[PDB]
Amino acid sequence: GSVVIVGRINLSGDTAYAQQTRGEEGCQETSQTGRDKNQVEGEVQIVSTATQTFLATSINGVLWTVYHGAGTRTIASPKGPVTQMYTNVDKDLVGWQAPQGSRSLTPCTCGSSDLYLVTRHADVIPVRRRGDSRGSLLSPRPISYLKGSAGGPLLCPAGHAVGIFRAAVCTRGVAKAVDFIPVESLETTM
Ligand SMILES: CCc1nc2ccc(OC)cc2nc1O[C@@H]1C[C@@H](C(=O)N[C@]2(C(=O)NS(=O)(=O)C3CC3)C[C@H]2CC)N(C(=O)[C@@H](NC(=O)OC(C)(C)C)C(C)(C)C)C1
Ligand SMILES: [Zn+2]
């Protein structure tokens, strides 16, 4: 089936919170047909397949997510399934054209290393950048807390996109750091 948008992380106000826009039955139906007529809003979408759920983030007019979540699948849209515009298994990255109604993040040009990871539960987690594709959690969390947030963004203090969350760096079940696709690699892929 297609990947289906089932909610979003609302970042528009003073408070970050998840919203569900489609339940599991409707999601299952929409995945089979590839036809999704629901209104899309925001920069960070919660998405699902038949078997998994994760995030997808709009940057530069593309809705980006991880290959390990989406594989080569289409995404459901008001006019039927939409094929990926980008697929890179080596970077664990896919992208589709961004849905009408979505808002896109701007790629960061700040050169700053104080970042913020947004999870599928609308937790905003500070992250110190530690390399091109790594950042440390200021406060370590069990894996559980981050599971299902691949595809979500790392943002700079100004709200620009710095990367897409890919993997957790763990020791005995605790995530001390994160691995992400840097926005420059998105821009190159482009
Ligand atoms: C580089 C990662 C990767 N690349 C892939 C490329 C292609 C591919 O093709 C099949 C598979 C890949 N798998 C991948 O990793 C897989 C997928 C990915 C994962 O689960 N991603 C998350 C997460 O939340 N995932 S998620 O729950 O949302 C899942 C629904 C998407 C964000 C994590 C939250 C806990 N993985 C790790 O994070 C592992 N850690 C990892 O390998 O650490 C390294 C890279 C530092 C060694 C865990 C599970 C031990 C924590 C293993
Ligand atoms: Zn920035």
Short mmCIF file of C-alpha atoms and ligand atoms in Angstrom, two decimals:
data_model
loop_
_atom_site.label_atom_id
_atom_site.label_comp_id
_atom_site.label_asym_id
_atom_site.label_seq_id
_atom_site.Cartn_x
_atom_site.Cartn_y
_atom_site.Cartn_z
CA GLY A 1 0.00 0.00 0.00
CA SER A 2 0.86 3.66 0.06
CA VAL A 3 2.30 5.56 2.98
CA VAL A 4 -0.54 7.54 4.54
CA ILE A 5 -0.55 10.79 6.51
CA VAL A 6 -2.35 10.11 9.78
CA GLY A 7 -1.55 13.24 11.75
CA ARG A 8 0.96 15.98 12.39
CA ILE A 9 3.12 17.63 14.98
CA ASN A 10 1.61 21.06 15.51
CA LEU A 11 4.38 23.62 15.94
CA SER A 12 2.38 26.70 14.93
CA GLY A 13 1.61 28.05 18.39
CA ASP A 14 3.38 28.40 21.74
CA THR A 15 2.92 24.71 22.54
CA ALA A 16 4.03 21.65 20.52
CA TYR A 17 1.47 18.87 20.34
CA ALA A 18 0.55 15.88 18.20
CA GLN A 19 -2.76 15.71 16.37
CA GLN A 20 -4.31 12.70 14.77
CA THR A 21 -6.19 13.33 11.53
CA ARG A 22 -7.01 9.71 10.51
CA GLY A 23 -7.77 6.57 12.52
CA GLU A 24 -6.40 3.06 11.87
CA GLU A 25 -9.35 1.80 9.81
CA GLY A 26 -9.30 4.85 7.52
CA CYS A 27 -5.55 4.60 7.30
CA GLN A 28 -5.77 0.97 6.18
CA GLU A 29 -8.34 1.86 3.51
CA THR A 30 -6.39 4.89 2.28
CA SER A 31 -3.20 2.84 2.04
CA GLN A 32 -4.88 0.37 -0.26
CA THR A 33 -6.49 2.96 -2.56
CA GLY A 34 -3.74 5.56 -2.38
CA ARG A 35 -6.46 8.22 -2.33
CA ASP A 36 -6.31 10.64 0.59
CA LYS A 37 -8.70 13.59 0.52
CA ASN A 38 -7.89 14.89 4.02
CA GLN A 39 -6.53 18.41 4.40
CA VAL A 40 -2.80 18.52 5.08
CA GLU A 41 -1.29 21.22 7.30
CA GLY A 42 2.09 21.91 8.85
CA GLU A 43 5.71 20.90 8.43
CA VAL A 44 5.93 17.60 10.30
CA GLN A 45 3.54 14.80 9.39
CA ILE A 46 2.91 11.57 11.18
CA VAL A 47 2.76 8.80 8.61
CA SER A 48 1.92 5.10 8.58
CA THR A 49 2.10 2.01 6.46
CA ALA A 50 0.28 -1.25 7.20
CA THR A 51 3.00 -2.22 9.63
CA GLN A 52 4.79 0.85 10.81
CA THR A 53 4.44 4.43 11.87
CA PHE A 54 6.99 7.22 11.72
CA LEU A 55 7.39 10.91 10.71
CA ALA A 56 7.89 12.84 7.52
CA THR A 57 9.14 16.45 7.26
CA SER A 58 8.67 19.03 4.48
CA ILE A 59 11.82 20.94 3.50
CA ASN A 60 12.11 22.91 0.21
CA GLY A 61 8.82 21.61 -1.20
CA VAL A 62 9.71 17.93 -0.60
CA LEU A 63 8.22 15.62 2.03
CA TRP A 64 11.18 13.66 3.32
CA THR A 65 11.34 10.45 5.35
CA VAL A 66 13.46 7.37 5.97
CA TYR A 67 13.76 4.44 3.54
CA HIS A 68 13.60 1.99 6.48
CA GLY A 69 10.04 3.21 7.09
CA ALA A 70 8.76 3.87 3.60
CA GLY A 71 10.82 1.66 1.32
CA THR A 72 9.92 2.47 -2.27
CA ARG A 73 6.29 3.13 -1.57
CA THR A 74 4.02 5.73 -3.01
CA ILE A 75 2.29 8.24 -0.80
CA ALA A 76 -1.48 8.63 -0.72
CA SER A 77 -2.78 11.91 -2.11
CA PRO A 78 -6.08 13.45 -3.21
CA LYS A 79 -5.60 12.26 -6.79
CA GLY A 80 -4.19 8.84 -6.06
CA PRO A 81 -0.77 7.43 -5.29
CA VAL A 82 2.27 9.63 -5.81
CA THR A 83 5.62 8.06 -6.70
CA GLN A 84 8.78 9.02 -4.84
CA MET A 85 10.77 11.87 -6.37
CA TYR A 86 13.87 10.83 -4.42
CA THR A 87 15.07 7.46 -3.12
CA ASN A 88 18.49 6.87 -1.62
CA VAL A 89 18.89 3.62 0.28
CA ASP A 90 22.51 4.49 1.07
CA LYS A 91 21.44 7.50 3.04
CA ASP A 92 18.20 5.92 4.30
CA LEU A 93 16.26 8.73 2.61
CA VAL A 94 13.16 9.06 0.46
CA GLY A 95 11.09 12.01 -0.63
CA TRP A 96 7.87 12.87 -2.37
CA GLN A 97 6.55 16.18 -3.64
CA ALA A 98 5.16 18.00 -0.65
CA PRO A 99 1.40 17.80 -0.28
CA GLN A 100 -0.80 20.73 -1.02
CA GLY A 101 -1.45 22.49 2.29
CA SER A 102 1.82 21.50 3.91
CA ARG A 103 4.32 24.20 4.94
CA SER A 104 8.01 23.62 4.36
CA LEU A 105 10.97 24.25 6.56
CA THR A 106 13.86 26.30 5.24
CA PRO A 107 17.28 24.63 5.15
CA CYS A 108 19.54 26.03 7.85
CA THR A 109 22.44 28.26 6.91
CA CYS A 110 23.27 29.34 10.47
CA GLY A 111 26.24 27.05 11.01
CA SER A 112 25.01 26.63 14.63
CA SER A 113 25.45 23.48 16.78
CA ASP A 114 22.60 23.98 19.22
CA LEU A 115 19.74 21.89 17.83
CA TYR A 116 16.31 20.58 18.73
CA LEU A 117 14.84 17.22 17.84
CA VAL A 118 11.07 16.99 17.42
CA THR A 119 9.55 13.61 18.25
CA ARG A 120 6.28 11.94 17.22
CA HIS A 121 4.97 12.73 20.71
CA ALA A 122 5.77 16.41 20.20
CA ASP A 123 8.65 16.29 22.63
CA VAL A 124 11.26 18.93 21.75
CA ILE A 125 14.59 17.51 22.80
CA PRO A 126 17.75 19.63 22.85
CA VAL A 127 20.66 18.14 20.90
CA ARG A 128 24.23 19.37 20.68
CA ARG A 129 25.63 18.84 17.19
CA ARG A 130 28.72 16.62 17.37
CA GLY A 131 29.54 16.08 13.73
CA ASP A 132 28.11 16.30 10.26
CA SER A 133 25.51 13.62 11.03
CA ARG A 134 25.54 13.18 14.82
CA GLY A 135 24.25 15.03 17.85
CA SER A 136 24.22 14.26 21.56
CA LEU A 137 21.12 14.37 23.70
CA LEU A 138 21.53 16.78 26.54
CA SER A 139 19.41 14.31 28.50
CA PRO A 140 19.65 10.63 27.50
CA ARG A 141 16.38 8.74 26.90
CA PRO A 142 15.45 5.06 26.54
CA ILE A 143 15.13 3.93 22.92
CA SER A 144 11.41 3.63 23.49
CA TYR A 145 11.08 7.38 23.68
CA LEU A 146 12.53 7.94 20.21
CA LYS A 147 11.03 4.93 18.41
CA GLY A 148 8.70 6.03 15.64
CA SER A 149 10.32 9.45 15.25
CA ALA A 150 12.64 8.63 12.34
CA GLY A 151 11.81 11.10 9.59
CA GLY A 152 11.39 13.93 12.08
CA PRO A 153 13.43 17.09 12.08
CA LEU A 154 16.40 18.52 13.85
CA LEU A 155 15.95 22.28 13.93
CA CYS A 156 18.24 25.17 14.69
CA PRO A 157 17.31 27.92 17.23
CA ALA A 158 15.66 29.93 14.42
CA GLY A 159 13.50 27.00 13.29
CA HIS A 160 15.38 26.05 10.17
CA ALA A 161 15.81 22.40 9.18
CA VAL A 162 19.25 21.02 10.02
CA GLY A 163 18.54 17.36 9.42
CA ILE A 164 16.22 14.36 9.35
CA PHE A 165 16.37 11.90 12.31
CA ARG A 166 17.61 8.49 11.08
CA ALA A 167 18.97 6.32 13.92
CA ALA A 168 19.64 6.35 17.66
CA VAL A 169 23.07 5.78 19.12
CA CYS A 170 22.48 3.49 22.04
CA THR A 171 24.18 1.81 24.93
CA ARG A 172 22.21 -0.74 27.00
CA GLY A 173 18.92 0.54 25.64
CA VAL A 174 19.59 4.24 26.34
CA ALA A 175 19.98 6.72 23.52
CA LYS A 176 22.88 9.12 24.26
CA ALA A 177 23.04 10.50 20.73
CA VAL A 178 21.26 10.64 17.40
CA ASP A 179 22.30 10.05 13.78
CA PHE A 180 20.62 12.23 11.18
CA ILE A 181 20.65 13.01 7.48
CA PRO A 182 22.05 16.57 7.27
CA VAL A 183 20.08 19.03 5.22
CA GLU A 184 23.11 19.54 2.97
CA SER A 185 22.84 15.94 1.93
CA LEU A 186 19.18 16.52 1.10
CA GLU A 187 20.17 19.57 -0.97
CA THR A 188 22.79 17.46 -2.82
CA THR A 189 20.33 14.61 -3.40
CA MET A 190 18.06 17.25 -4.87
C1 LIG B 1 21.78 3.95 9.60
C2 LIG B 1 20.51 3.39 10.06
C3 LIG B 1 19.74 2.59 9.03
N1 LIG B 1 19.86 2.75 7.71
C4 LIG B 1 19.07 2.00 6.90
C5 LIG B 1 19.18 2.19 5.52
C6 LIG B 1 18.42 1.42 4.69
C7 LIG B 1 17.61 0.47 5.13
O1 LIG B 1 16.82 -0.31 4.28
C8 LIG B 1 15.96 -1.32 4.81
C9 LIG B 1 17.51 0.28 6.52
C10 LIG B 1 18.24 1.07 7.38
N2 LIG B 1 18.14 0.90 8.72
C11 LIG B 1 18.87 1.65 9.52
O2 LIG B 1 18.85 1.49 10.90
C12 LIG B 1 17.69 0.89 11.50
C13 LIG B 1 16.55 1.80 11.64
C14 LIG B 1 17.01 2.71 12.74
C15 LIG B 1 15.87 3.14 13.72
O3 LIG B 1 15.25 2.42 14.43
N3 LIG B 1 15.55 4.53 13.61
C16 LIG B 1 14.67 5.16 14.52
C17 LIG B 1 13.18 5.02 14.43
O4 LIG B 1 12.46 5.58 15.11
N4 LIG B 1 12.71 4.17 13.49
S1 LIG B 1 11.15 3.99 13.31
O5 LIG B 1 10.80 3.37 14.53
O6 LIG B 1 10.38 5.04 13.06
C18 LIG B 1 10.91 2.77 12.03
C19 LIG B 1 9.50 2.98 11.57
C20 LIG B 1 10.62 3.59 10.79
C21 LIG B 1 15.06 6.58 14.92
C22 LIG B 1 15.41 5.44 15.82
C23 LIG B 1 14.61 5.47 17.01
C24 LIG B 1 14.95 4.47 18.07
N5 LIG B 1 17.94 1.92 13.52
C25 LIG B 1 18.48 2.41 14.73
O7 LIG B 1 18.18 3.54 15.10
C26 LIG B 1 19.45 1.54 15.50
N6 LIG B 1 20.63 2.27 15.84
C27 LIG B 1 21.59 2.36 14.78
O8 LIG B 1 21.77 1.51 14.00
O9 LIG B 1 22.62 3.10 15.27
C28 LIG B 1 23.77 3.30 14.49
C29 LIG B 1 23.44 3.76 13.07
C30 LIG B 1 24.50 4.43 15.20
C31 LIG B 1 24.62 2.03 14.41
C32 LIG B 1 18.74 0.99 16.78
C33 LIG B 1 17.47 0.29 16.39
C34 LIG B 1 19.74 0.12 17.46
C35 LIG B 1 18.45 2.12 17.70
C36 LIG B 1 18.16 0.64 12.86
ZN ZN B 2 19.40 28.04 11.12
#
